[PDB]
A paper describes a structure:
Collapsin response mediator proteins (CRMPs) are cytosolic phosphoproteins that are mainly involved in neuronal cell development. CRMP-4 is encoded by the gene DPYSL3 (dihydro­pyrimidinase-like protein 3). Like the other CRMPs, it is involved in neuronal development and binds to tubulin dimers and microtubules. The structure of CRMP-4 closely resembles the enzyme DHPase, which also belongs to the amidohydrolase superfamily.
CRMP-4 was crystallized in two different crystal forms, form A belonging to space group P21 and form B belonging to space group P21212. CRMP-4 (form A) was solved from a twinned crystal. The data scaled in the orthorhombic space group C222; however, the model could not be refined. Careful analysis of intensity statistics showed that the crystal belonged to space group P21 and was twinned. The twin fraction was refined to 31%. The model consists of a tetramer in the asymmetric unit. Residues 12–496 (or 497 in chain B) are resolved in the electron density. The electron density for the 6–8 C-terminal residues is weak (from residue 490 in chains A and C and residue 489 in chains B and D) but is sufficiently well defined to build a good model. Crystal packing in both crystal forms show that the truncated C-terminus points towards the solvent region, where sufficient space is available for the disordered residues. Hence, it seems very likely that although full-length protein is present in the crystal the C-terminal tail is dis­ordered and cannot be resolved in the electron density.
Residue numbers in the entry:
A (entry chain B): 12 to 497
B (entry chain A), C (entry chain D), D (entry chain C): 12 to 496
């Protein structure tokens, strides 16, 4: 875990629970001291913060680095993708292991570990996607939680005849994951109806990217979410809705939380920063750059409403779902949108987008910003307070943040290998100046200083208090009752 | 269609759109004249209304008379069940044809027609349940609409491995029924989750009727409805949600209608009049009397909220889902609730319940009462204004109604063959005095005067304007843009 | 009354409750016969409808013809304003009597009748605005309902120190009007907060029309509505919200109706057809053409939503609130928006707008279009079925309507005296071909054939069943007595 | 600040943001150390927690100790009232200074400080009620925030002609308090309508306590809250709704917070634990024990819903609004409910009620319990992390809490001087074992060990980040345009 001593002076420290002035001293990957007039060795490297903010580093809970799809890989791998993370203030990522149906979960995990251990600039952890379900899979799941530092698995309600699962299967999986202390994630979209609406759009000769969005209107995201929430509630399992893109999906989550259901919602940079009118762009490749599932909503009031609910705590946390394909790989579907590979950028811009859209607009303050950028992630995934908090003993991943900075986003300038950036030409308030990860300065003066494979896998235990205390209480509370009769 | 000519004087006529004083003259099953100082043949029978209400007769859009179950039948057949209808002011019923899976739809319809033509006291029509789906069934559906006077079909989202249908099947069926001009009805409950929750309740040794309601909490009715509404909307098909029992199911419908979706909701006497606390009764047979699906809600604020949303038009119409089994037949599940046959009473009490609960409580007036008891049914099912309206040319089925009457309901008294009445001991304001059906007096002074088989089948054409005009318009606009590149 | 005989053949008749093919025969201002192969006199004028629609004529429940303003008058008087009504398919109007504070209500009514009796092309009735309250005013109100054919009064929650009323006053007025059987209308906006926000905007140097809309954001409309609905409910008085312009106001109404509150909502042409982005127009006179209160919302999603709720029955009826001022008169406030006179056009375009926006877009069908354009107005204001219905005995005001017609709106072609039309350049689907009022053809081939003063005042009795049956049930239901202790 | 050394071993520490096992060492009123195998002086007093919970001590944000009333005082003074606090796990209180209309605010504050400094067992702070408004009051408000440690003021929308304020006044006050960095609290009830409904109830001869609740139905609480939220929003002032008693009031707050409005809601023990059916009790004194304003709701589903929204964070914090009168003092109104003094118990039972109702029922976990019982109060009122958190440097006020304890509440056993307890006979899961305040053991083995006047006034600075960061951004954001032309 070795790093130099590091001292940051005159900083204003912003955590999710309060802000305060103090100096921070770091050593060997851990924060050692916080306060004034700190007693420290001489000739230690010192950064002068001058009252600029110091925050916990971002935790992007959703990535797809160098993800397999049909004999291709996404263009940003674990190395270049995490450079893109650190560039934008994110010091940890959580990626999705995707086993082939009938493939082994554990084998896919080993493989993903090898890729990541070897290339990642920063710490990371892993979700494991359950792309098919049967008795051996159920055993692997158990083994991954016990021996492998996984506590999060994702099922698919979409992709009919590929990954899609029946209602019985959902019920059995949520029952299992709940019993084991895991988080049940969902890709919540109704694959059965989408299959029909795709065929209808193609019969109507709408093969461009506009047919992607039109074949998955938000009604079908909504339905899938309502069903998942229902089943998660019958099986007393926590649910986590990934990639929240529509208003109606976010209402349902808000509505379910108020009722007392244990549900989390994960908007992504895309839904928080832009909308879906660009599927209608005359430039085909630009339209295809936005193809991701679920799609960006065409209702332009959507980004504002999603930031409003992230501000209110009705959505709890943000990720990016970074999946990047080259113009060339996207072109594979130039005659049929269903063949366009799905994914966009967003890892580098996540924090800037939310600051620009939710903070600078007076929706949330800097403390709730930290929450939705790192601190809630940490609690959900059982990384708290090691991550998502500046306090003594916590890992020394953190960021000096400039609320008055202004940047234009361009593909010209971004770390991503892709030629397109869906936020191209956008002007964002708020950006990082300095990034420390693992106690080491990894960004300063617009220069990255990274090392490939430095990142460690962070094992995530199950049963995080944040998620499971109310579930435990409900389990034990339960005493159903016969009516005793003659 | 022959009847004696009949004259009702001094009546106050209540239709869904207005009330007014006038005399009514009838002959040969049709209303012939309305107004004052009417001219008539000699020796015509006369009834003196004395300013009491005269309304269109009820249309109960949901029955299961003499419905097959395990080689036995529900105890109220088409004859005795329709006696129970007329006794409570209902002059027409719409029953559900239930084909055995893999059985023919048309064959089941022929068979139902024979049963009903032969026994029914009053006019009737038929829904056809689509209990399984394939290329042949699709053809029967088309034939039934074209040649057989059916315009309403019901799918099941519940009864996994018995009638249950996949989402792909739903989509295909709504697409078909929409194209053909039919009403798509749903039993909206999630069969997949109920199967698990049943097993869990039995593993917990809850075999009594309380396990029936606890294995189908209203979350699962709500989900099924949300999914059905969603699919019906993608396929531009009108949807009709049967047997609305919960507040959450009724909110979704209210919510969908506001947004513009073409959706109807059908509460039943049971949900409108009582609640589900009686699954917990220590008397096993009383608890089982309430076993119906979806179940009565245990949340006792439910009947009041359902009447409130029927009042506000967020639910449009009422039926009874009358399905009666003897104590003996219910007992089949005395060791396991999943073997208890599903169904309750309600045909006889429907109009009294709604009057007592929604009118006498000031939620709806007498005109909206007529709407939810007859006039809206007629419009949905394309029977308007022949039924659900007192005007010249309309069929002469109608009722002299006493708003000041008060009755106690009991099994001791009711037309039903069943030994139990789920509304037992309840006191209801509002009841019929006289019922005319087909132009003939079928109830007076507490005596029924019926004839078995007198009822006619009423063919129901598709594309009712009330349901389909907005659907037709939408297809038209349903033209699709593309980007040119 | 007296009019020639008139026969309209081959028409498709559209009422709120059904459509059907039949011929219509008229004589002396009344519809005499409906059906096929009508037996009639020879050489009667005949119109060939050819399967085009025939509807009841529009009833615009909100107008301000030749309304007094600071020694001005609005530019469209009772004659030219009703020509504009008929030109767009409206055959009746209901105008607002506006007494000067401390002036007599009855004196203002006498004056308004003289104006209207003398000039109006078509039948009409009157709302009476209560701009001040005291013991005497309470007496005039009673007298107007008993002898003068008024049943609708409007209070103001805005215009602080002009017409504005306290909560105590609201309570006393609703209590009175409810007891008397009247409809309580409201201008629902919080005058207290607007006064502040106006001053703040002016101190900020925002004197253009954009300051009008910015000084009355919809939050304040919403608050006034909530408070009105609350008080109406405590006092068991029906409430009628005029000029519904915002989404949040319409949600409250929808929300209140679902609960069972007796509340009606009146959107107007402006809110149904266009939005408020035009207060930001750099052309000053165009911006000022939209100045009305409450203002058009700047949220461009608003017209679509208002039509959606009018479609769903959550708003029941439409008017125009026609109040037109010349470019000159508007210019009075060119240095201070609070001096810009308030009002816009809309009487001529109302039916076309709703058709274009709500029917041709598949939101409502032709039958609900009739309801929101005439039939609901008639029931609320106690004119049904004399108006808002094509049936024997009803008045012969009606319209042959072309759903496939398309018109561009411009002031160049409109009947209004004003130089600006807030719907300028808009293309609308649906327009009238032929308009019959009073049994006489008043529009055909693009020519109006009117007569000044031909219009009759229609007296409107209180206690319309549609509004008051639930109210009466709630009074009579109340049994409040002390807990014996 | 001096206290003995104190060590608590084997405890499970529960804060709003996590739980964990560690030992706690305390000295001189401050927590000194947290963790395992702590290095400490020998022979220090040691408490063995054995894995029982240790939480921050409750902060009851709403009390009325020895409050003036009509030359009467409430029966629990600052000493005995704060004994009642500590007995139930509460280690800080925030009371309401109530100046008589037209008195000095500062003079009332001095007086209140003298009463509290002298008698209070535990730390405290003060809200200041603004019972009348003018230019000097505004000045006092400023002074109190700048020199006197006050950051919270309450206004009254009720009590017409006593404390009630106009909309203009509300606007001016919120504008001021927002500019000054204070929290604007409200008693949100419509005093204008209540005045009428009281009379009517009396004019109806309903003089018992049932008339209290029936003269203030929740419709009127709702309206006031809507109006306050609206005004707070126009004036960019944070709003704090006190004594949230009804579901509809809590929905509005939930609804406003979602929109982004800065609003907080304060349920109280009474609304969280019991309901209002007892105003109908035949025992007059029992009924009068519940008389408080706003009243407990008669809708028995209310407590469950208020706990549900406190669980969800839609209501953020709890207080008790403790205001106790003797049976004798309550009897003053035995002939007229409007003369019954308003208030109830609740300080002692607050934490037990919420645990029983919201935690033991699986609605909220132990961490959100700490938040609604202390941590959120601390942030709102700018006491964090000194209070509402167990961490090194924070004040050593805390509690060892037994989630498996079960107590019956009775007046027989409570610290309050009153003869009645509205939670009489109720069984509550969860109770404190040991209470440490100021580093001193003030409850152990059912014995209180208190010292009168030991409590310190805690000055509360304005502009707490939790409340004002979004407000500052909005004000900062408001650079506005004029349309140049
Ligand atoms: Na005239």
């Amino acid at each position: 875990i070795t790093s130099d001593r590091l001292l940051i002076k005159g900083g204003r420290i912003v955590n999710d629970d309060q802000s305060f002035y103090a100096d921070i001293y770091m050593e060997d990957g851990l924060i050692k001291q916080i306060g004034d007039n700190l007693i420290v060795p001489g000739g230690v490297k010192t950064i002068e913060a001058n009252g600029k903010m110091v925050i916990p580093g971002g935790i992007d809970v959703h990535t797809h680095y160098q993800m397999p799809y049909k004999g291709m890989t996404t263009v940003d791998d674990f190395f270049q993708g995490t450079k893109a993370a650190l560039a934008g203030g994110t010091t940890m990522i959580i990626d999705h292991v995707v086993p082939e149906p009938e493939s082994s979960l554990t084998e896919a995990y080993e493989k993903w570990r090898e890729w990541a251990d070897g290339k990642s600039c920063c710490d990371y952890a892993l979700h494991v996607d359950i792309t098919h379900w049967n008795d051996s899979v159920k055993q692997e799941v158990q083994n991954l939680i016990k021996d492998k530092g996984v506590n999060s698995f994702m099922v698919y309600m979409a992709y009919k005849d590929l990954y899609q699962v029946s209602n019985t299967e959902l019920y059995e999986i949520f029952t299992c994951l709940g019993e084991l202390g895991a988080i049940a994630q969902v890709h919540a979209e109704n694959g059965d109806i989408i299959a029909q609406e795709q065929t209808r759009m193609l019969e109507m000769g709408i093969t461009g990217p506009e047919g992607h969005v039109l074949s998955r209107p938000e009604e079908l995201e909504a339905e899938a979410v309502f069903r998942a929430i229902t089943i998660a509630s019958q099986t007393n399992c926590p649910l986590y809705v990934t990639k929240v893109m529509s208003k109606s999906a976010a209402d349902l989550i808000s509505q379910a939380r108020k009722k007392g259901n244990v549900v989390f919602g994960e908007p992504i940079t895309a839904s928080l920063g832009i909308d879906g009118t660009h599927y209608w762009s005359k430039n085909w490749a630009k339209a295809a750059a936005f193809v991701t599932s679920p799609p960006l909503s065409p209702d332009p009031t959507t980004p504002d409403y999603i930031n409003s609910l992230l501000a209110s705590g009705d959505l709890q946390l943000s990720g990016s779902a970074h999946c990047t394909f080259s113009t060339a790989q996207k072109a594979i579907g130039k005659d049929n949108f269903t063949a366009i590979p799905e994914g966009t950028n967003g890892v580098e811009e996540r924090m800037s987008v939310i600051w620009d859209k939710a903070v600078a607009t007076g929706k949330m303050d800097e403390n709730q910003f930290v929450a939705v950028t790192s601190t809630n992630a940490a609690k959900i995934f059982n990384l708290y307070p090691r991550k998502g908090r500046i306090s003594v003993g916590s890992d020394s991943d953190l960021v000096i943040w400039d609320p008055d900075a202004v940047k234009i986003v361009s593909a010209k300038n971004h770390q991503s290998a892709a030629e397109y950036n869906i936020f191209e030409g956008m002007e964002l308030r708020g950006a990082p100046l300095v990034v420390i990860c693992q106690g080491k300065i990894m960004l300063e003066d617009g220069n990255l200083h990274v090392t490939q494979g430095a990142g460690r896998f962070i094992p995530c235990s199950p049963f995080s208090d944040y998620v499971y205390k109310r579930i435990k209480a409900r389990r034990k509370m339960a005493d159903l009752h016969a009516v005793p009769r003659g």
